[PDB]
């Protein structure tokens, strides 16, 4: 009898660890069933896929920079001197059964992970979920975006191919060596000397697989622990007040819905990792300081920084026999953007003047200023992301070769203002649409 | 609250309500999905859910089969088995993604068509604690501090702060004391003693009068022997990536020569682009203060490393005499001492003086008159 066995196991568990009171509270937890509340579920599920596929990749990856001669099965690269990182990356794709499938799934999972965070960030931003008491959860989440910002960048550079090798020379060195007073000291401490050095990949590999994921896992655990004990908010509606949660219980509606949603994420990621080819490293060969690939092609999560570099004017300062290159503006801009993003609720509660407990999500149309600001930020981010494909864009109108950066350099003040005005007017119109 | 006697006769329906009441959960609405059993619509829905679940099992079995019995080895382009190899990875993701996607689809359709609809309201006790847990925890923490009498013992408190601070400063200083390296510690032997890494490159003479050839790479740089360059080894309107090669560096036939040649290619400031301007274009040529006599006739030598962020600029338009860096799209007017015209570049590319030795192969007349590569705080 299966029922008898379950009763015996339940009696044994209860008589040892008396979890009946604690388990019942967990099973009775109520979560809202809004569609936009699954945005954070995708980011968490994508992180799990990255954990599983990342462990598989470490069984065949050598993070060494030692020069070796290729001797695999790839004809076009036979006899080409390369590093151990590039050779083992080629070994995974070609000489390991299913290695290419896992490698493409892992890269696709990283993109979905990064995309989900940004889309989930907008949901928190637009609905005003960063208010009290969830102000500290925004800070923890903001740090997770920054950690995932560099985590994807480091992993993309692990194969040490020509494309990624140029992105660790254009960003991790020129911008780091261009910092005032203590700029070449950091570059020396992070590469162990000059570029490329011999401890670039091994140091990044240790950071990328363990140290950064360890902080991310700890922050995610604290993030999920907060939301579980903060009794996640809900949209205003019939029967929804500030002192109640309307939705479904964990067992069995939420558990099945949440668990089956994990299956779709794996299925979508698995389908994209087999049918869609991403990051073909064998086409351009190993990274060499002598030769160069056309672009420093990054993924879209770490692409807005490259667009800002090209669009920013060549402004440099030379105070008293020194040099402040153009890369300082990009690095400073990242600091200002990250600082503003992290301390957003604290600024909002200073200008709006409200410091009361909030549990019902604000409608985005109810706050036209915040909605317009968010739309302006999204439009600015999209323009910066699309600013680094100017090579393709230039060969579309054939009116001037250097006029594509002028569109970008002028459009950084005109287009965001246009989006801000349209969003502001649309929010007001929607307020009076049903009133 | 109820005793064991009452719980004996309680049904499962009211037992769930009692459990929710303790936790503050009130199930205000719950209805079975199919009010009438045995209807054809319910039976049809059961088959549809089972069909999705059975698809996952069939696709899961296919994944095991395609992984084992299928040509997976890499095949060269244009081969008899190249087409089969190109379908290996897509079949791996098609039979795996669809196997679990259909399972998730079937499970969701099961909880939207068979698990009864329920909406439950849980009273959230947000805000401050009910004034009895607040006072007790405040007294518990205050009693520990007041009972320990640490506040009234200043000598112990000051020593603890200084002792922990001194230990922390030493520990943190000894924890990040191995990562700090002086960037200006003379380590590269040059003609004049030892200089720092940034001030030097592959073209820096190790002794007075050292001969460095603008050698061309027969194949891939660092993997093929370097060959010397004749002045007329490039037609008017071309470009060659020369590297600093010495006569003692060998041709890579030995391990010590191969290591020397590898370091030449791995040099971040080593590559230099050689450009020859047509004789009918020297009227519109502007020199640089200090580099007026650096060119040799119609031959100009400029570093391949971009001055903005260090990307090796390989693209070059012979029609406009423009050097294009492919990373951030910066053009460098070769006629105006490789000065950056457009883009984020702000400093002109360094010019390497060149001349001709007794033999006749292009040699470097000396070192750069300015640091090569991206600018830093201590530059110029």
């Amino acid at each position: 009898d299966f029922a008898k066995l379950a009763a015996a196991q339940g009696d044994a568990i209860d008589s040892r660890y008396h979890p009946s009171a604690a388990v019942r509270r967990q099973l009775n937890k109520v979560f809202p069933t809004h569609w936009s509340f699954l945005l954070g579920e995708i980011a968490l599920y994508s992180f799990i896929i990255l954990l599983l596929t990342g462990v598989w990749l470490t069984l065949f990856f050598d993070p060494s920079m030692a020069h070796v001669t290729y001797d695999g099965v790839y004809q076009p690269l036979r006899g080409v001197q390369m590093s151990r990182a590039y050779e083992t990356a080629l070994d995974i794709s070609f000489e390991v059964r299913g290695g290419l499938f896992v490698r493409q799934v892992h890269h696709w999972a990283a993109l979905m992970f990064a995309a989900s965070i940004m889309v989930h960030l907008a949901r928190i931003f637009f609905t005003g979920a960063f208010r009290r008491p969830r102000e500290a959860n925004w800070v923890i989440g903001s740090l997770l975006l920054i950690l995932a910002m560099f985590e994807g960048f480091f992993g993309y550079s692990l194969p040490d191919d020509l494309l990624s090798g140029t992105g660790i020379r254009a960003a991790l060195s020129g911008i780091t060596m261009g910092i005032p007073v203590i700029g070449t000291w950091m570059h020396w401490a992070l590469f162990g000397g000059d570029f490329p050095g011999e401890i670039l990949i091994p140091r990044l590999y240790a950071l990328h697989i363990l140290l950064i994921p360890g902080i991310i896992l700890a922050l995610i655990g604290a993030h999920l622990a907060l939301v579980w004990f903060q009794k996640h908010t809900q949209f205003p509606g019939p029967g929804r007040t500030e002192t109640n949660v309307v939705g479904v219980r964990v067992m069995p509606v939420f558990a099945v819905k949440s668990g089956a949603f994990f299956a779709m994420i794996t299925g979508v990621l698995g389908l994209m990792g087999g049918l869609l080819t991403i990051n073909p490293i064998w086409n351009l060969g190993p990274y060499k300081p002598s030769q160069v690939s056309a672009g420093s092609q990054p993924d879209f999560y770490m692409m807005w920084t490259d667009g800002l570099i090209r669009l920013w004017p060549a402004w440099e300062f030379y105070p008293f026999g020194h040099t402040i290159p153009q890369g300082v503006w990009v690095a400073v801009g990242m600091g200002l953007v990250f600082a503003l993003l992290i301390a957003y609720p604290f600024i909002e509660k200073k200008v709006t003047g409200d410091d009361a407990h909030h549990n019902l999500l604000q409608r985005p149309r109810d706050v036209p200023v915040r909605t317009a600001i968010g739309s302006m930020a999204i439009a600015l981010y999209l323009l910066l992301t699309f600013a680094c494909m100017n090579d393709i864009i230039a060969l579309k109108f054939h009116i001037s070769l250097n006029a594509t950066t002028w569109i970008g350099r002028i459009g950084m003040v005109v287009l965001p203002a246009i989006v801000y005005f349209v969003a502001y007017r649309w929010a007001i119109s929607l307020q009076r649409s049903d009133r | 609250q109820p005793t064991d006697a009452e719980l004996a006769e309680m049904s499962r329906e009211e037992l769930v309500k009692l459990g929710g009441k303790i936790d503050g959960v009130e199930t205000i609405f719950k209805e079975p999905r199919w009010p009438v059993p045995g209807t054809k619509a319910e039976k049809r829905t059961e088959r549809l859910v089972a069909y999705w679940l059975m698809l996952g099992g069939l696709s899961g079995l296919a994944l095991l089969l395609v992984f084992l019995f299928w040509p997976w080895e890499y095949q060269p382009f244009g081969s008899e088995g190249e087409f089969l190899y190109s379908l290996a990875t897509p079949l791996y993701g098609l039979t795996f993604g669809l196997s679990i996607l259909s399972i998730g689809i079937g499970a969701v359709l099961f909880q939207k068509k068979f698990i009864p609809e329920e909406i439950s309201v849980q009273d959230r006790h947000d805000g401050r604690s009910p004034e009895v847990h607040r006072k007790t925890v405040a007294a518990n923490l205050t009693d520990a501090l007041e009972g320990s009498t640490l506040k009234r013992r200043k000598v112990i408190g000051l020593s603890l702060g200084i002792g922990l601070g001194a230990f922390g400063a030493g520990t943190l200083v000894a924890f990040i004391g191995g990562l700090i390296k002086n960037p200006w510690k003379p380590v590269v032997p040059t003609a004049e003693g030892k200089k720092a890494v940034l001030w030097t490159s592959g073209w820096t003479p190790r002794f007075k009068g050292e001969t460095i050839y603008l050698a061309r790479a027969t194949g891939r740089p660092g993997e093929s022997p370097f060959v010397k360059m004749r002045p007329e080894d490039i037609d008017a309107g071309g470009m060659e990536t020369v590297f600093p090669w010495r006569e003692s560096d060998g041709d890579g036939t030995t391990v010590e020569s191969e290591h020397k040649l590898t370091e030449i290619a791995m040099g971040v400031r080593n590559p230099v682009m050689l450009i020859r301007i047509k004789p009918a274009d020297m009227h519109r040529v502007i020199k640089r203060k200090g580099q007026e006599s650096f060119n040799f006739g119609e031959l100009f030598a400029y570093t391949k490393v971009c001055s903005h962020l260090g990307c090796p600029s390989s693209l070059y338009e012979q029609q406009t005499y423009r050097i294009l860096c492919p990373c951030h799209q910066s053009q460098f007017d070769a006629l105006e001492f490789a000065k950056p015209i457009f883009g984020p570049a702000a400093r002109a590319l360094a010019q390497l003086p060149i001349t001709i030795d007794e033999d006749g192969y292009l040699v470097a007349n000396g070192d750069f008159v300015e640091p090569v590569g991206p600018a830093f705080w201590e530059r110029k």
Partner: peptide, 25 residues
């Protein structure tokens, strides 16, 4: 601002001499 050590000049220049090559490397 503009780079101080980067100024154009109108000096014509002279043809470089033949390199000799010092001995004793």
């Amino acid at each position: 601002c503009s780079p101080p050590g980067e100024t154009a000049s109108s000096e014509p220049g002279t043809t470089p001499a033949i390199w000799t090559g010092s001995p004793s490397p």
